[PDB]
Structures are given as structure tokens and as C-alpha cells.
Amino acid sequence: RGRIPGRQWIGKHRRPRFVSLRAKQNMIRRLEIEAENHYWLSM
Amino acid sequence: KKLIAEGPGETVLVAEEEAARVALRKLYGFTENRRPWNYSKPK
Amino acid sequence: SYLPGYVPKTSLSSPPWPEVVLPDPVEETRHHAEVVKKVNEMIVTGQYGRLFAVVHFASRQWKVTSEDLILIGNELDLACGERIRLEKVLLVGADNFTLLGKPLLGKDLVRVEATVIEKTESWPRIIMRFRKRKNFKKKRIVTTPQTVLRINSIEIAPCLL
Amino acid sequence: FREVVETQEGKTTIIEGRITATPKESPNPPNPSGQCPICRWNLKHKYNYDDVLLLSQFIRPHGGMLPRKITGLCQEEHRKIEECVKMAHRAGLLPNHRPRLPEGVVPKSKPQLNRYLTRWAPGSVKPIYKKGPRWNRVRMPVGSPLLRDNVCYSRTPWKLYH
Amino acid sequence: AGGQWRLQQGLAANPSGYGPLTELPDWSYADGRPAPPMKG
Amino acid sequence: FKNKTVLKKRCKDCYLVKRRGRWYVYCKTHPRHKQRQM
Amino acid sequence: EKDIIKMLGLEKAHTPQVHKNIPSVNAKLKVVKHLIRIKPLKLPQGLPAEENMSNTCLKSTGELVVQWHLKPVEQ
Amino acid sequence: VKCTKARYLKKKNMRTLWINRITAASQEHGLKYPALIGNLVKCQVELNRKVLADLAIYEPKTFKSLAALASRRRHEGFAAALGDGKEPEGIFSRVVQYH
Amino acid sequence: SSFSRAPQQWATFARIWYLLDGKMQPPGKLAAMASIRLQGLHKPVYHALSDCGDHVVIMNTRHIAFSGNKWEQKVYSSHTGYPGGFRQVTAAQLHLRDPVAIVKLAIYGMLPKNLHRRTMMERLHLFPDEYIPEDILKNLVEELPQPRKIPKRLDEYTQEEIDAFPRLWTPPEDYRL
Amino acid sequence: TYSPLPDDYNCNVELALTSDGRTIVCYHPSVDIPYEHTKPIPRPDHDQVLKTRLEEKVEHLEEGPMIEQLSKMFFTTKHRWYPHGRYHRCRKNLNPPKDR
Amino acid sequence: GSKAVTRHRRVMHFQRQKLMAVTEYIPPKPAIHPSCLP
Ligand code: FES
Numbered sequence: 001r002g003r004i005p006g007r008q009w010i011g012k013h014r015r016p017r018f019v020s021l022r023a024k025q026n027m028i029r030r031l032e033i034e035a036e037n038h039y040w041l042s043m
Numbered sequence: 044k045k046l047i048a049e050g051p052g053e054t055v056l057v058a059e060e061e062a063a064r065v066a067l068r069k070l071y072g073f074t075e076n077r078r079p080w081n082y083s084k085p086k
Numbered sequence: 087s088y089l090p091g092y093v094p095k096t097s098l099s100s101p102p103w104p105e106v107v108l109p110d111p112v113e114e115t116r117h118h119a120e121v122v123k124k125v126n127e128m129i130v131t132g133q134y135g136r137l138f139a140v141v142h143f144a145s146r147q148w149k150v151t152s153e154d155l156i157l158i159g160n161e162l163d164l165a166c167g168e169r170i171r172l173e174k175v176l177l178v179g180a181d182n183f184t185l186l187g188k189p190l191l192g193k194d195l196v197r198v199e200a201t202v203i204e205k206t207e208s209w210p211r212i213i214m215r216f217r218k219r220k221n222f223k224k225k226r227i228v229t230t231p232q233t234v235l236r237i238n239s240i241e242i243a244p245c246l247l
Numbered sequence: 248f249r250e251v252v253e254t255q256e257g258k259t260t261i262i263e264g265r266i267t268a269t270p271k272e273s274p275n276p277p278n279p280s281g282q283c284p285i286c287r288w289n290l291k292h293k294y295n296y297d298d299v300l301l302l303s304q305f306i307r308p309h310g311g312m313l314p315r316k317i318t319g320l321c322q323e324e325h326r327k328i329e330e331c332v333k334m335a336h337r338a339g340l341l342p343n344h345r346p347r348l349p350e351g352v353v354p355k356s357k358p359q360l361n362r363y364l365t366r367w368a369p370g371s372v373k374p375i376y377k378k379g380p381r382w383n384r385v386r387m388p389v390g391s392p393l394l395r396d397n398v399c400y401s402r403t404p405w406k407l408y409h
Numbered sequence: 410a411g412g413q414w415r416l417q418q419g420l421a422a423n424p425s426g427y428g429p430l431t432e433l434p435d436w437s438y439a440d441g442r443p444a445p446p447m448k449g
Numbered sequence: 450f451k452n453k454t455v456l457k458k459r460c461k462d463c464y465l466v467k468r469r470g471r472w473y474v475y476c477k478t479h480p481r482h483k484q485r486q487m
Numbered sequence: 488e489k490d491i492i493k494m495l496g497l498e499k500a501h502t503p504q505v506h507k508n509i510p511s512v513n514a515k516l517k518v519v520k521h522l523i524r525i526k527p528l529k530l531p532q533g534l535p536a537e538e539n540m541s542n543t544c545l546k547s548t549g550e551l552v553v554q555w556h557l558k559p560v561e562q
Numbered sequence: 563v564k565c566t567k568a569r570y571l572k573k574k575n576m577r578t579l580w581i582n583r584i585t586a587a588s589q590e591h592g593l594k595y596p597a598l599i600g601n602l603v604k605c606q607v608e609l610n611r612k613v614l615a616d617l618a619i620y621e622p623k624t625f626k627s628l629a630a631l632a633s634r635r636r637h638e639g640f641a642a643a644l645g646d647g648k649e650p651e652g653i654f655s656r657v658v659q660y661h
Numbered sequence: 662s663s664f665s666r667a668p669q670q671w672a673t674f675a676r677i678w679y680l681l682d683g684k685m686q687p688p689g690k691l692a693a694m695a696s697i698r699l700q701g702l703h704k705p706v707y708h709a710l711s712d713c714g715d716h717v718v719i720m721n722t723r724h725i726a727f728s729g730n731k732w733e734q735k736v737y738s739s740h741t742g743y744p745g746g747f748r749q750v751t752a753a754q755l756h757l758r759d760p761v762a763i764v765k766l767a768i769y770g771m772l773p774k775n776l777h778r779r780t781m782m783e784r785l786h787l788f789p790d791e792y793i794p795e796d797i798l799k800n801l802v803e804e805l806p807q808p809r810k811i812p813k814r815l816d817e818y819t820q821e822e823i824d825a826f827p828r829l830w831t832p833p834e835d836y837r838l
Numbered sequence: 839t840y841s842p843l844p845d846d847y848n849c850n851v852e853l854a855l856t857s858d859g860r861t862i863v864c865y866h867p868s869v870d871i872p873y874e875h876t877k878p879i880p881r882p883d884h885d886q887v888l889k890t891r892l893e894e895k896v897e898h899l900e901e902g903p904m905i906e907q908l909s910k911m912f913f914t915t916k917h918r919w920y921p922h923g924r925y926h927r928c929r930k931n932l933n934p935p936k937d938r
Numbered sequence: 939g940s941k942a943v944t945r946h947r948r949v950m951h952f953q954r955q956k957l958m959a960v961t962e963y964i965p966p967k968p969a970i971h972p973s974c975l976p
Pocket residue numbers: 281282283285286287291320321324973974975
């Protein structure tokens with residue numbers, strides 16, 4: 001039981017992917033670098 | 044009541060004999076961790 | 087008899103770990119000098135046997151002792167029999183004491199010498215690539231120059247102050 | 248507190264109530280501004296199901312909870328203690344607060360299973376016969392969500408579902 | 410391990426970067442003469 | 450008992466009780482009002 | 488975005504490159520701002536001279552020092 | 563082809579082995595692996611995992627000293643974090659600056 | 662150490678016997694501890710092919726405690742192989758049938774899924790109560806600390822501890838508690 | 839009284855810094871086992887007219903019983919005890935290299 | 939593929955899922971719960 005129809009990560013019905021805590025922290029870490037890039041490009 | 048030597052073994056007799064060898068090595072200065080032989084040119 | 091931040095004792099009132107009280111820096115500075123003096127006297131009086139050292143050489147670290155062999159994975163431009171000093175010593179250890187660099191020990195403190203005893207090449211190393219159904223196949227053989235070093239002596243000087 | 252004694256003398260029943268000794272709150276609470284017993288002693292978020300010394304003050308002699316109007320607890324804390332007491336009973340930490348049994352009732356022996364952090368009543372829960380896929384796994388709840396805000400001394404947060 | 414900490418001390422995140430551990434000569438002649446500079 | 454996703458009291462004598470992990474509507478006056486959470 | 492990375496000399500990752508802080512350069516940097524880290528070059532001892540050209544080191548703080556002794560600070 | 567690709571795994575597996583061995587030695591002294599490695603770096607001790615694993619096996623007294631040093635540096639970190647800056651830097655927390 | 666070569670090797674690779682008390686302990690934490698010891702992962706000389714695992718003796722496995730409602734919810738599934746042979750039992754049912762099965766299954770699932778696993782299980786000695794055979798009792802070396810601290814029941818608190826905890830509220834004198 | 843680690847099992851660790859602060863000195867003498875913490879070694883283990891002779895009690899066991907005995911004695915599975923074929927026996931290196 | 943407007947809630951690209959997770963509303967949390975103060 002518990003089959004995903006067709007291929008897992010494409011199509012209409014897909015296997016749900018969830019966002020882990022460290023995935024969030026990774027994204028926020030790069031958001032901080034880009035925010036600082038904005039600043040040093042302002043002068 | 045002071046530990047001169049200690050030896051491992053698979054039997055008490057074997058362990059006791061090994062401990063005697065360890066004590067002899069310490070008494071005679073042939074310990075595994077003794078100062079290595081000096082091969083440097085004589086001064 | 088209750089301070090403003092007093093909490094009754096519960097399973098979560100305080101942290102699980104025990105409280106640690108570190109020594110007074112002034113009192114510990116005096117204790118440190120005593121320890122250093124004691125170890126220094128052991129060096130002066132020669133109260134050590136075989137020494138070992140951790141040396142950084144050719145990008146990597148080697149735990150060594152007198153009479154050891156180490157296989158350097160490159161050529162060194164030295165004739166066989168030439169004696170050299172290993173200048174990057176991270177650690178020197180004895181039965182009863184150990185000295186640690188931050189990250190490297192001073193050259194006055196420890197001297198590690200070694201001798202080139204062989205200059206050769208490694209056995210043949212096959213490099214082959216293959217991708218199925220793509221007529222993609224290639225083979226290369228490489229032999230890497232090597233140098234064998236013998237550690238002759240590890241000596242320490244009473245320069246701990 | 249107030250007791251009640253029923254005495255039948257000469258085919259006559261007399262119902263009377265007497266005032267017994269009453270315990271008093273300890274003096275000088277560390278946070279007099281607090282609006283309930285919990286925050287008056289800076290205990291908010293700092294107690295658990297096994298803190299029977301705390302929990303036992305808010306329960307009846309037979310293990311029942313006391314009304315919130317009497318204790319003075321706030322709804323938030325009153326609900327936390329309510330769940331904590333249920334878990335304390337189920338863990339066997341309140342052996343002197345058992346239910347009242349009528350005369351002539353000796354409970355039949357029942358299998359002893361040591362348990363703790365038991366959210367639900369054992370009899371009301373069904374087996375997890377079908378666990379489900381990893382992305383839709385049926386989980387076994389542990390502890391209570393009411394205590395999610397308790398002080399966490401570890402870097403990992405409390406896992407409430409196993 | 411420790412990359413962020415090293416950066417906070419003004420050091421290279423990787424200890425293989427700049428500093429005495431990498432740049433100083435690996436060896437010298439026993440007599441005292443310095444070795445030819447390393448290729449890296 | 451009729452299975453219901455939404456439990457509703459149908460008279461003043463209906464009372465909501467949670468038993469065996471689910472909510473029930475019980476009514477002594479009109480037993481037909483009895484409902485089980487689905 | 489691939490082509491601007493080449494134009495800025497950033498083909499190899501984690502390899503610092505120095506660029507002029509001017510509108511034209513900034514215009515390119517903005518296209519690829521999500522791919523790079525921008526920090527100001529700091530010159531605590533001024534610009535390198537001909538005498539000290541060979542003794543410079545770019546630290547992780549962004550300061551380009553003109554003396555690199557590889558020795559501990561006596562202070 | 564297997565022989566060629568195995569050169570990557572050999573390096574990977576060796577480091578995994580060192581971490582397992584270092585983890586075991588650290589637990590004997592009540593320290594978790596991340597606590598030992600992290601705090602040794604903060605003491606400017608750059609011993610790599612290969613040497614650390616060798617020390618655990620053949621130099622157990624030196625390893626306990628390293629474990630003690632890491633434990634000491636770890637406690638100094640806690641004291642600093644709990645303080646508001648009033649306290650001076652820990653004796654083992656001072657960093658040797660190079661230029 | 663200055664030992665002879667053969668005694669030196671014998672000592673380093675010797676098998677230690679550990680004792681673990683399962684009373685009021687969750688089987689998973691017991692299993693995590695036993696698994697490390699049975700594999701040899703607690704030794705700096707560890708290597709997969711060094712067959713360096715130790716003996717683990719777990720007593721009082723009848724008195725393990727699950728958190729939550731795992732007694733009712735956790736199901737153990739097996740299949741005899743015959744049509745209709747699928748069997749599912751709750752942890753409670755299995756425990757009363759076999760007072761060592763739960764701990765044994767928890768350990769078995771944590772060990773590496775290779776041919777060494779069944780050899781490691783031969784070094785595991787599970788006992789439901791506090792009775793341990795004399796031979797096994799004689800070879801024990803060290804008892805491992807229990808992973809879970811057992812909470813005290815209200816009747817186990819000393820009057821000093823009870824007196825130290827403050828009274829938090831004043832009940833009304835006219836309330837029938 | 840502060841000690842980073844307990845000093846009662848392996849060695850007495852004392853950590854110190856040099857005055858310059860560039861070297862960490864670690865003094866770690868060994869701790870000897872106390873005499874009180876030891877046990878005594880168990881040295882302690884008729885008009886027979888006829889010389890007592892050695893009696894062979896090594897009755898041969900069949901493969902199954904023998905393997906069960908060995909597996910129980912060494913706490914192993916039966917598999918290790920069964921023989922292997924000629925192909926594997928002749929592949930084993932009988933003069934393997936020896937480091938020390 | 940599926941059109942931009944669907945009857946079901948279309949699965950998002952993983953990067954977009956992460957974006958949503960990182961930009962969720964965080965309410966202002968007071969130092970002391972207002973119910974615990976006069
Ligand atoms: S009013 Fe403070 S916790 Fe209830």
C-alpha cells in the first residue's frame with residue numbers, strides 16, 4: 001500500500017515534499033548574504 | 044602494597060607470569076617506552 | 087526568604103547539567119606557572135624516555151617517533167642520505183607530559199630530524215573510465231613519485247617559561 | 248477545609264459539618280504581582296507531569312481536579328495542570344489518590360504495564376495496524392501539546408509524536 | 410568544523426588557507442641552511 | 450446511533466459526551482437523536 | 488547570468504576578485520547579486536607600494552595588509 | 563573502473579572510521595564528538611582526525627589531556643555566554659594573533 | 662605497556678561483559694545502548710571486520726516502560742508464510758506472551774543489516790526478572806547507568822523535600838475538599 | 839577543586855599555559871591501582887591401591903552436536919564452523935605480509 | 939503539464955515551498971504574558 005501514481009516527483013499527483021528545519025536555515029543564511037550585497041551596491 | 048608491575052593474560056597463571064616479565068623489564072631498563080638508542084655522531 | 091527570581095525546585099526549574107565553577111584567574115595563573123616549572127625541570131633532568139611528535143609535512147599530519155618511516159607521496163629534491171629538520175611540530179608527547187602548539191610549537195622547544203633513505207615511484211595506478219552504450223572507454227596508467235623518510239631523533243629543550 | 252460526618256443514633260440521622268485545619272500559602276511569594284499561584288512563584292513553563300509536589304496541591308483526595316474558581320489558576324495553567332495530573336495518575340506517581348471504592352469491591356488483578364507521558368486513556372486507543380507511507384506516517388503521540396512552551400534546555404525541541 | 414569560528418578571529422575559514430601552518434617552510438637542512446621555497 | 454461528521458443536539462434533552470475517544474450525542478427522551486462521531 | 492559571471496572573472500568559486508565600485512560594474516553585479524558575495528576592500532595600511540608588492544595578503548575580513556610576517560604579535 | 567572510483571570511497575570511509583573511533587574515545591571521557599572537535603579548534607589545536615584517532619589508540623593519556631582541554635574550553639564558553647561582558651576572557655580562550 | 666606481544670593483543674581485543682537494568686526504562690534507549698556495545702562502537706580500536714563486540718546482559722526486561730500510548734498503539738507484524746498467516750499483535754499482547762521479545766526486537770532492528778547481526782545477538786543475554794544465572798553473573802565487569810531517570814512517586818518524597826516546596830495557594834476554609 | 843574530567847581512572851591531568859601563552863603544557867602521570875581495590879589471586883583449586891591413570895573423556899561428537907557445542911562455547915552462530923570448499927581454501931594467502 | 943489555474947491545489951516547486959515556509963507571519967510575542975500582570 002501507499003503507492004504514488006506514475007513517477008514520484010512529476011505529474012498531477014506527486015509525493016509530498018516537506019521543508020525541514022535545516023532547509024529553512026539554509027535559505028535564510030543566503031537571504032542574509034544577498035541583503036548585505038544590496039547594501040554594498042547602494043554607494 | 045605498592046604496584047611494581049601489572050600483566051594481562053588469558054589465565055591467572057599466564058597473567059602472573061607476564062606481570063613478572065613486566066617487572067623485570069622495568070627493573071633492567073628495557074621498557075618499551077625507554078629512551079631510544081642515540082645514533083648521533085659522537086661529540 | 088525568597089528573592090525576586092526565586093523558583094521552587096521542580097524538574098525544569100534549573101538546567102539538567104551540574105553547575106561548573108571555574109578557578110580564579112589570579113590563583114590559576116600561579117598554579118599554571120608551577121605546572122610549567124615542574125614539567126620544565128623534567129626536561130632539564132631528562133625524566134623522559136621515548137618521545138613522539140605530530141608533524142605537519144606535505145599538507146598532512148604524521149604521528150612519528152624515533153626510527154619511524156613515512157612515505158611522502160611526492161618528490162622532495164633531496165639526495166638520498168641527506169638529513170633534514172621537520173619544522174612544523176604540532177605536538178610533542180612523553181610518558182608523563184605533552185606539549186601542544188597553538189598551532190605550532192616554537193623551533194627552540196623541539197627539533198625533529200629525518201633522513202631521506204629512498205626515492206622511488208609508486209606501483210602502477212590504473213585510471214579507467216567507462217559509460218555504457220556510448221562507445222566511451224579510456225585507460226590511463228600513472229606512477230607517482232615517492233620519498234621514504236626515516237625519523238632519526240626527536241629532541242626537546244628546557245625552554246618552557 | 249470542611250468535613251461532613253453522618254451518624255445514626257437511636258434510629259435518627261444527624262448531618263453535621265466541621266471546619267478542619269486549613270493550609271496557608273507560604274509567605275513572601277517571589278512575584279507578588281503574579282495573577283495566579285503559578286506566576287506568583289515564577290513557575291510558568293517550569294513544571295512537568297512528574298512534579299507531584301506541585302500537582303498534588305490542586306487535586307482532591309481521590310485524585311480529581313479542583314475547580315479553577317477555588318484554586319485561582321488561570322485557564323491556561325489550569326488546563327496544563329489538568330493534563331499533568333492525568334499523566335501523573337497514569338504513570339503511577341499518585342498512589343495515595345486512588346478512586347473511592349464502595350464497600351465489598353476488590354478490583355480484579357489487571358496486567359501491570361509501566362507507562363509515562365501518556366496523553367490518552369489506554370482503553371480508548373486503537374492499534375496502529377497500518378502505519379502509512381513515510382510521507383503520511385501515523386504517529387504515536389507522546390506527552391501533551393499543552394506543555395509545548397515548557398522551557399527547553401536542549402537544542403532539539405520536545406518531540407510530541409513518535 | 411570551526412569554519413565560522415575561524416572567520417570570527419580574522420582567520421581563513423579553512424586552516425589550509427593563509428597562516429603559518431601552511432605558508433611556513435615544511436623543512437630545512439639539518440645544518441641550518443634553508444630549503445628552496447615550496448612550489449605551492 | 451447514526452454516524453455524523455457534525456454532531457448536533459436535536460432537543461433540550463440531548464447531551465454531548467466524549468467516550469472511547471470520540472464524541473457522542475445521547476438522548477434519553479428521544480433515543481433516535483443518538484449520534485456517533487464519524 | 489552565466490555570461491556575466493565569466494565577464495567578472497568569477498568562473499572559479501570561492502576565489503576573491505577585486506572590481507571597481509562604479510555604476511557600470513554595479514549594473515553587472517546586480518544581475519548576478521544572488522550568486523555572489525560582495526564586500527568592501529579595506530586598506531588599513533594604505534595601498535601597496537612597489538617595495539611591498541610581494542608581501543601582501545588578503546584576509547578574510549576584507550583587509551588587504553601590505554606586510555605578512557607569519558609571526559605572532561609581540562604585543 | 564571500480565578500482566578507479568574506489569579511490570573516492572577509500573578517503574570517505576577512512577574519515578568515517580576516524581570519527582567513529584574519536585567518538586568512542588570521547589565518550590569514554592563523557593564528551594560528545596562535536597564538543598571535542600569544536601572546542602579543540604577554539605584552542606588553536608589543529609590536529610586532524612587521523613592523528614586524533616591514532617592518539618586515542620596508542621597515546622591514551624595524551625588523548626585524555628586533549629579531552630580535558632576541550633572540556634575546559636567548552637566550560638569557558640558557557641561562562642562567557644552567561645556573562646554580560648563583565649568577565650575577562652578565559653585563560654584558555656585567549657587566541658594567539660599572527661601577522 | 663611493556664607487555665609481551667601476545668598478551669598485549671589479547672587484552673586490547675578482549676570481550677567485556679556489561680550489565681543493564683531495564684526496570685522502568687524505555688526499550689529503545691536500552692536498545693541504543695546495547696547496540697553500540699554489541700557492535701564494539703564504544704572502543705577506539707573499532708573496525709567492522711575486527712569482531713570486537715562485547716557481551717550485554719539486560720535484566721528486568723519484564724518491567725520496561727513505553728512512553729505515551731505505545732502499549733496499545735505499537736503493533737508487531739509477522740507472517741507465517743502460509744495463506745492467512747499475517748499476524749499483528751500490540752506491544753501489550755506481545756509483552757505478556759514473551760517478556761523479552763520487545764527489547765530483543767528493538768535491539769535486532771538497530772544492529773547493522775548484515776551477516777554479523779545474528780552473531781552479535783548471540784552476545785545478548787536478556788532476562789525478564791532479577792534472576793541471572795551464576796555463570797553469567799560471575800563474568801560481569803561493569804553495570805551501565807540507566808538511560809532514564811525514574812521519577813519519584815509522591816509517597817517516596819521525604820518530609821524535608823515536601824516542606825521545602827512552598828504552599829502556593831490558600832484554600833477557602835469553608836470548602837469541602 | 840575544579841577538574842575538567844575525573845582523575846581516578848586513567849591519569850591525573852593538569853593543564854597549564856606558558857607565560858607567553860603560546861604553548862599548552864599537559865602533565866599526565868599514571869594512576870596506579872590501589873592495593874585495596876584488588877582481589878587475592880585464587881591459588882587454591884585416600885587409600886587407592888591402583889595407580890590412577892589418565893582417562894580419555896574426549897568422546898567423538900557428530901558434526902551437528904559438535905557445532906552446537908562450539909557455537910555455545912564461543913557465543914557464535916553455527917555457520918562459522920562448517921567447512922569451505924577447495925576453491926576458497928586454496929585462495930587464502932598462507933604467507934601474508936606482516937608489519938611488525 | 940497542468941495549467942496555472944486548477945481545481946485542486948497544485949503542488950508547488952520545492953524552492954517555492956521553502957520560500958513560503960521562510961516568509962510565514964510571526965506574531966509579536968510579549969516578554970511577559972499580559973494575563974500575568976495587573
Ligand atoms: S496568571 Fe500567571 S501563569 Fe496564570
